[PDB]
RNA sequence: AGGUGAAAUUCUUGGAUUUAUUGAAGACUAACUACUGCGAAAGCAUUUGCCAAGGACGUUUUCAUUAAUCAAGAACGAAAGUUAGGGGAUCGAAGAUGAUCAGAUACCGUCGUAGUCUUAACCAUAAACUAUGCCGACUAGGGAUCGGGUGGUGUUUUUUUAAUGACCCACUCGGCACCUUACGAGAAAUCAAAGUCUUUGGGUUCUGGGGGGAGUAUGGUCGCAAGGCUGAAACUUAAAGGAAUU
């Protein structure tokens, strides 16, 4: 698993866990 | 370099900045150098071109004006007429002016 | 179902007066039919071909001449010098490696109402006892090169429009005075006039075009 | 590890070039990483060359040449063009003939 | 001084309106209010006395310019287009 | 290499290399008491002039200052020192 | 001394047009496309098609009465292969063997400026 | 008061009677109060100067021109709006010009046109923000403001 | 006609595809152009004009330690992405679809909005590579090649030996890399630097410590965002990795 597409995975789970924690802001 | 040429003339010679003082130095007949700004009132210029010949002086349409001619004549304030009476150690008499 | 070749009438080309065989060629026209005439049905054409043929000079293996059809008389079209071309096969030929290429372009008008844009290529050559496997110009030298290149072109243009210009165009008298300036600086090889094209004429005045056609 | 001096292909003295499009699968590869060749061949084949001059006009004429340039992408320049993964030692080797 | 931060002269539009809008306003608002220069008397006494009007405090010289600047990108290149063609006008 | 003297060395590899890597930096220039045609005097002209050196009596020009040693101006009799 | 002209052969990959015209061309003579003499797609740039295509254009010429002709070959170029297809091979040898006065032949293909993008992408056409 | 670009209060004499009636041209981004305007084909190419288009060439931009050569103003009337000129065919005077959304209208070379764009750079390229400047906007135009949406009534 | 390994969609016999006379748009600058130039890095590939810059060389000019390198901090920072307007010619993320394919949401094909690029602002990241910091003198020869400098009764310029410009040979510092052994170093590959390092110390910036978790949690902080600068822990694991050989 190349880190180019893996930095993209964490990237999606980043906007993801920032909006879920920002849901209960 | 017309820049440093008048640097010495103000650093030695007798110069007069301003319509009155310059037309007053011309009405006395002891200035042989008048530098006009190609942006200042041509009404003002028109008479100074007419005095140029009346006071036998070599005019010179300066590539500048108040904050151009004034910039090099080392003074924070504005001026467009540098009517030189007698130069110091610079021969702006026989040059490209 | 008519096979329109039966329609199209055959033509014949006739160069100005400063060309070898004025009878440049035989082509096709258009028989007068529905909502169309003949003499004023073409003209908006050209005449590009091997200049060596239209000049009968086999030494001009390359180079080409461009002619715009003007007025026709007696089904014998009297073409006019529309300009000059350069076989792409010779452009690449003169472009050798380890040297510098110099293409020039400038505009110039004639004293007898007319405008065109002539060219003049140039290339860097070696020395009598050259050693380096390169040999390029000094750039600022390339500037003095192109400086007098366009300079000289527009110095002999004034006179008899492109009629007298072609009288020095194909004979390559250009290279002679152009090579004179290039000598005191960098030798260079070739140095021709490449191509060129017209853009402004006085009008459709074949009265002036009578000097070549007679 | 690194197996060439100029990294992969000639790149020393500057910082960036200008990539030219491959003449095969259009792959954009730097002008310094471009394997060129001048195929300035004729338009005649390998048989009708004399049949041309024969069924032709003009005293042999002169015959034309098409000076072309062949840029390559390396990947497709190996699936054909001159290369064939050279020997280890002669990797440094270079030759015009 | 710093009674603001990044809001500058548009901090008055507080909660009312939108952030993006005012941001744009700032750039142009800051433009016409500014004590512009009368490049005819050589003293920056000219200013937006009205839209497309810039009056000089000296010699009372009213000036034709832009809707916010003494001259935008428009009259800029066009002013030189004339200088450029005014060349084949006498030369 | 191995062993060499650096006191009385060849005046060859001495006055050819860089006068900064040779030894005691020595100026490789000089002046010229060139004659000024049209009077009777001579001017002590420095090799690398740069500033247009001319006459003093019937002023004219001595040598045009080039990108090194101001070569004479066509007709001028130069003399070392 | 004859009725010369131009052939304007087009050696594009998967096609070849042999339309003999005049010095101007504003008025053309014949054209005969490649797939005209062969329906198969795969053989549009094939050599046998070029001969048969250039063989038919030769017969059409002696119908109007044209003698000499100048073949101006053209590659797809521009932003394409720029490499003269296999058609412009047996096409020249087709009208040469047909019996025409092959004249001052030159060339004028589309000058690939490189300027305009070459359809494919940065990672190119990864066949 | 109803336009986002100043008006030239250009006063003129009358060579047919000792007198001076003030004509009214439009303002050009690049003119001064006391600036000199010249009208008559026999005048140098300068901003504010107005001569038929049989005086200027292509690329040359003007404003407050016509469609009817000499209707005393027509096309080229607006803030930050300009009109370039491309083609130019003499004899039977018919020049080709370039209008706003990309329109091209050919016209006689005796078509009056003043050199220079109408004052108002990036005017509407700025937000109105407060409906206030929106009220007083049409306060000098017409009661077309506001705009009741159809779907709701 | 287009196109492919070969097809199909697509433009078909209201004239396509192909030829040519003209016109406009935007884009770009081919060939010349390379183990070369310049730039601080990114980069910069046409010409002219203006306006300045930069830098080698050379100088029997001026000052006179003014310097070196740098936390925090500040200018520029390709491209993507972005706010918005001049406008997307090509190409072309997405998408649509033609087949291939057991399938194909891909690879190849046709079109096509972002973007392209400009005008004014942004984010500050790239295998941003010379994976090799800046400065210091010395351990090495060679051929080249770049720029300027000196020497030549030398080549040519021939219009008179006219002045000289280009070229040829030695050397030269400052450029650019390469070749040669490598004395030495180095795990080897290699490297005139990574030499001058157990015989270990010319000054100094910055960084790293088995591997994962992980540029991640969280806080701050910059950013219009995307995210950037900043940066864990638990837990688990005795192998992971580099080079060179078989």
Curated annotation (Swiss-Prot), chain C:
It comes from Saccharomyces cerevisiae (strain RM11-1a) (Baker's yeast). It is found in: Cytoplasm. Component of the small ribosomal subunit. Mature ribosomes consist of a small (40S) and a large (60S) subunit. The 40S subunit contains about 33 different proteins and 1 molecule of RNA (18S). The 60S subunit contains about 49 different proteins and 3 molecules of RNA (25S, 5.8S and 5S). GO terms for biological process: translation. The lineage of its organism: Eukaryota, Fungi, Dikarya, Ascomycota, Saccharomycotina. GO terms for molecular function: structural constituent of ribosome. Belongs to the eukaryotic ribosomal protein eS1 family. This is Small ribosomal subunit protein eS1A. GO terms for cellular component: cytosolic small ribosomal subunit. Keywords: Acetylation, Cytoplasm, Isopeptide bond, Phosphoprotein, Ribonucleoprotein, Ribosomal protein, Ubl conjugation. Its main location: cytoplasm. The keyword Cytoplasm applies. The keyword Kinase does not apply.
Curated annotation (Swiss-Prot), chain E:
It is found in: Cytoplasm. GO terms for molecular function: structural constituent of ribosome; zinc ion binding. A zinc finger (C4-type) spans 38-59. One of its GO terms (cellular component) is cytosol. Pfam families: Ribosomal_L37ae. GO terms for biological process: cytoplasmic translation. Component of the large ribosomal subunit (LSU). Mature yeast ribosomes consist of a small (40S) and a large (60S) subunit. The 40S small subunit contains 1 molecule of ribosomal RNA (18S rRNA) and 33 different proteins (encoded by 57 genes). The large 60S subunit contains 3 rRNA molecules (25S, 5.8S and 5S rRNA) and 46 different proteins (encoded by 81 genes). This is Large ribosomal subunit protein eL43A. It comes from Saccharomyces cerevisiae (strain ATCC 204508 / S288c) (Baker's yeast).
UniProtKB/Swiss-Prot annotation, chain G:
Component of the small ribosomal subunit (SSU). Mature yeast ribosomes consist of a small (40S) and a large (60S) subunit. The 40S small subunit contains 1 molecule of ribosomal RNA (18S rRNA) and 33 different proteins (encoded by 57 genes). The large 60S subunit contains 3 rRNA molecules (25S, 5.8S and 5S rRNA) and 46 different proteins (encoded by 81 genes). uS11 interacts with eS1 forming part of the mRNA exit tunnel. uS11 interacts with snoRNA U3. uS11 interacts with MPP10. Component of the ribosomal small subunit (SSU) processome composed of at least 40 protein subunits and snoRNA U3. N-terminally acetylated by acetyltransferase NatA. Present with 29600 molecules/cell in log phase SD medium. Component of the ribosome, a large ribonucleoprotein complex responsible for the synthesis of proteins in the cell. The small ribosomal subunit (SSU) binds messenger RNAs (mRNAs) and translates the encoded message by selecting cognate aminoacyl-transfer RNA (tRNA) molecules. The large subunit (LSU) contains the ribosomal catalytic site termed the peptidyl transferase center (PTC), which catalyzes the formation of peptide bonds, thereby polymerizing the amino acids delivered by tRNAs into a polypeptide chain. Residues 118-127 have a biased composition (Basic residues). Residues 107-127 are annotated as: Disordered. Its main location: cytoplasm. Coiled coil: none annotated. The keyword Lipid metabolism does not apply.
Curated annotation (Swiss-Prot), chain H:
It is found in: Cytoplasm. GO terms for cellular component: cytosol; cytosolic large ribosomal subunit. The modification Phosphoserine is found at residues 1, 44, 108-109. One of its GO terms (molecular function) is RNA binding. Keywords: Cytoplasm, Isopeptide bond, Phosphoprotein, Ribonucleoprotein, Ribosomal protein, RNA-binding, rRNA-binding, Ubl conjugation. The keyword Endoplasmic reticulum does not apply. There is a cross-link at residues 42, 68, 94 (Glycyl lysine isopeptide (Lys-Gly) (interchain with G-Cter in ubiquitin)). One of its GO terms (biological process) is maintenance of translational fidelity. It comes from the Eukaryota. Component of the ribosome, a large ribonucleoprotein complex responsible for the synthesis of proteins in the cell. The small ribosomal subunit (SSU) binds messenger RNAs (mRNAs) and translates the encoded message by selecting cognate aminoacyl-transfer RNA (tRNA) molecules. The large subunit (LSU) contains the ribosomal catalytic site termed the peptidyl transferase center (PTC), which catalyzes the formation of peptide bonds, thereby polymerizing the amino acids delivered by tRNAs into a polypeptide chain. There are 2 genes for uL2 in yeast. Belongs to the universal ribosomal protein uL2 family. Component of the large ribosomal subunit (LSU). Mature yeast ribosomes consist of a small (40S) and a large (60S) subunit. The 40S small subunit contains 1 molecule of ribosomal RNA (18S rRNA) and 33 different proteins (encoded by 57 genes). The large 60S subunit contains 3 rRNA molecules (25S, 5.8S and 5S rRNA) and 46 different proteins (encoded by 81 genes). The gene is RPL2A. The chain holds residues 52 to 204 of 254 of the full protein.
């Amino acid at each position: 698993m190349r880190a180019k597409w893996r930095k993209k995975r964490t990237r999606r789970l980043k906007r993801k866990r920032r909006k879920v924690r920002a849901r209960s802001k | 370099s017309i820049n440093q040429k008048l640097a010495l003339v103000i650093k030695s010679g007798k110069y007069t900045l301003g319509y009155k003082s310059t037309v007053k130095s011309l009405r006395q007949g002891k200035s042989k150098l008048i530098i006009i700004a190609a942006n200042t009132p041509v009404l003002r210029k028109s008479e100074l071109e007419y005095y140029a010949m009346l006071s036998k002086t070599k005019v010179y349409y300066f590539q500048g004006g108040n904050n151009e001619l004034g910039t090099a004549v080392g003074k924070l304030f504005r001026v467009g007429v540098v009517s030189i009476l007698e130069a110091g150690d610079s021969d702006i008499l026989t040059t490209l002016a | 179902v008519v096979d329109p070749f039966t329609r199209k009438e055959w033509f014949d080309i006739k160069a100005p007066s400063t060309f070898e065989n004025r009878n440049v060629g035989k082509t096709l026209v258009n028989k007068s039919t529905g909502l169309k005439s003949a003499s004023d049905a073409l003209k908006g054409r050209v005449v590009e071909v091997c200049l060596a043929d239209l000049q009968g000079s086999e030494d001009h293996s390359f180079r080409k001449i461009k002619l715009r059809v003007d007025e026709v008389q007696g089904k014998n079209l009297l073409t006019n010098f529309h300009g000059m071309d350069f076989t792409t096969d010779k452009l690449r030929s003169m472009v050798r490696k380890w040297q510098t290429l110099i293409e020039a372009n400038v505009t110039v008008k004639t004293s007898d109402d007319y405008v065109l844009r002539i060219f003049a290529i140039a290339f860097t050559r070696k020395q009598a006892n050259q050693v380096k496997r390169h040999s390029y110009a000094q750039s600022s030298h390339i500037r003095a090169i192109r400086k007098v290149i366009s300079e000289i072109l527009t110095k002999e243009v004034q006179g008899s429009t492109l009629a007298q210009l072609t009288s020095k165009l194909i004979p390559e008298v250009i290279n002679k005075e152009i090579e004179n300036a290039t000598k005191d600086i960098f030798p260079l090889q070739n140095i021709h006039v490449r191509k060129v094209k017209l853009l402004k004429q006085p009008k459709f005045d074949v009265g002036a075009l009578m000097a070549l056609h007679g | 590890p690194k197996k060439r001096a100029s990294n992969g292909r000639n790149k020393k003295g500057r910082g960036h070039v200008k990539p030219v499009r491959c003449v095969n699968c259009s792959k954009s590869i730097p002008k310094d990483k471009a394997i060129k060749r001048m195929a300035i061949r004729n338009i005649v084949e390998a048989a009708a060359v004399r049949d041309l001059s024969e069924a032709s006009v003009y005293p042999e004429y002169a015959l034309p040449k098409t000076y072309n340039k062949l840029h390559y992408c390396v990947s497709c320049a190996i699936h054909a063009r001159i290369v064939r993964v050279r020997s280890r030692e002669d990797r440094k080797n270079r030759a015009p003939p | 001084a710093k009674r603001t931060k990044k809001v500058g002269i548009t901090g008055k539009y507080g909660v009312r309106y939108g952030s993006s809008l005012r941001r744009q306003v700032k750039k142009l608002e800051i433009q016409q209010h500014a004590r512009y220069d009368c490049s005819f008397c050589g003293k920056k006494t000219v200013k937006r006395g009205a839209a497309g009007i810039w009056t000089c405090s000296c010699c009372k010289k009213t000036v034709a310019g832009g809707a916010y600047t003494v001259s935008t990108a428009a009259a800029a290149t066009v002013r030189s287009t004339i200088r450029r063609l005014r060349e084949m006008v006498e030369a | 290499v191995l062993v060499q003297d650096l006191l009385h060395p060849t005046a060859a590899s001495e006055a050819r290399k860089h006068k900064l890597k040779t030894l005691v930096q020595g100026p490789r220039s000089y002046f010229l008491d060139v004659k000024c045609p049209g009077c009777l005097n001579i001017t002590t002209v420095f090799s690398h002039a740069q500033t247009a050196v001319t006459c003093e009596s019937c002023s004219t020009i001595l040598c045009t200052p080039t990108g090194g040693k101001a070569k004479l101006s066509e007709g001028t009799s130069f003399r070392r020192k | 001394s004859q009725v010369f002209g131009v052939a304007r052969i087009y050696a594009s990959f998967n096609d070849t047009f042999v339309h003999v015209t005049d010095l101007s061309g504003k008025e053309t003579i014949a054209r005969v496309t490649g797939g005209m003499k062969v329906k198969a797609d795969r053989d549009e740039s094939s050599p046998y098609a070029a001969m048969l295509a250039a063989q038919d254009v030769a017969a059409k010429c002696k119908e109007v009465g044209i003698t000499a002709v100048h073949v101006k070959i053209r590659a797809t170029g521009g932003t394409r292969t720029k490499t003269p297809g296999p058609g412009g091979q047996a096409a020249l040898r087709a009208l040469a063997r047909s019996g025409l006065r092959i004249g001052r032949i030159e060339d004028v293909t589309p000058v690939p400026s490189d300027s305009t993008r070459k359809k494919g992408g940065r990672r190119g056409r990864r066949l | 008061s109803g336009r986002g670009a100043p008006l030239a209060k250009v006063v003129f004499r009358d060579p047919y009677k000792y007198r001076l009636r003030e004509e009214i041209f439009i303002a050009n981004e690049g003119v001064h109060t006391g600036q000199f305007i010249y009208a008559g084909k026999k005048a140098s190419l300068n901003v504010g100067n107005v001569l038929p288009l049989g005086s200027v060439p292509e690329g040359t931009i003007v404003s407050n021109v016509e469609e009817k050569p000499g209707d005393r103003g027509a096309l080229a009337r607006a803030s930050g709006n300009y009109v370039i000129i491309i083609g130019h065919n003499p004899d039977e005077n018919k020049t080709r010009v370039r209008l706003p959304s990309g329109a091209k209208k050919v016209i006689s070379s005796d078509a009056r046109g003043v050199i220079g764009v109408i004052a108002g750079g990036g005017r509407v390229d700025k937000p109105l923000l407060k409906a206030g400047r929106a009220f007083h906007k049409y306060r000098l135009k017409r009661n077309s403001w506001p705009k009741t949406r159809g779907v709701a009534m």
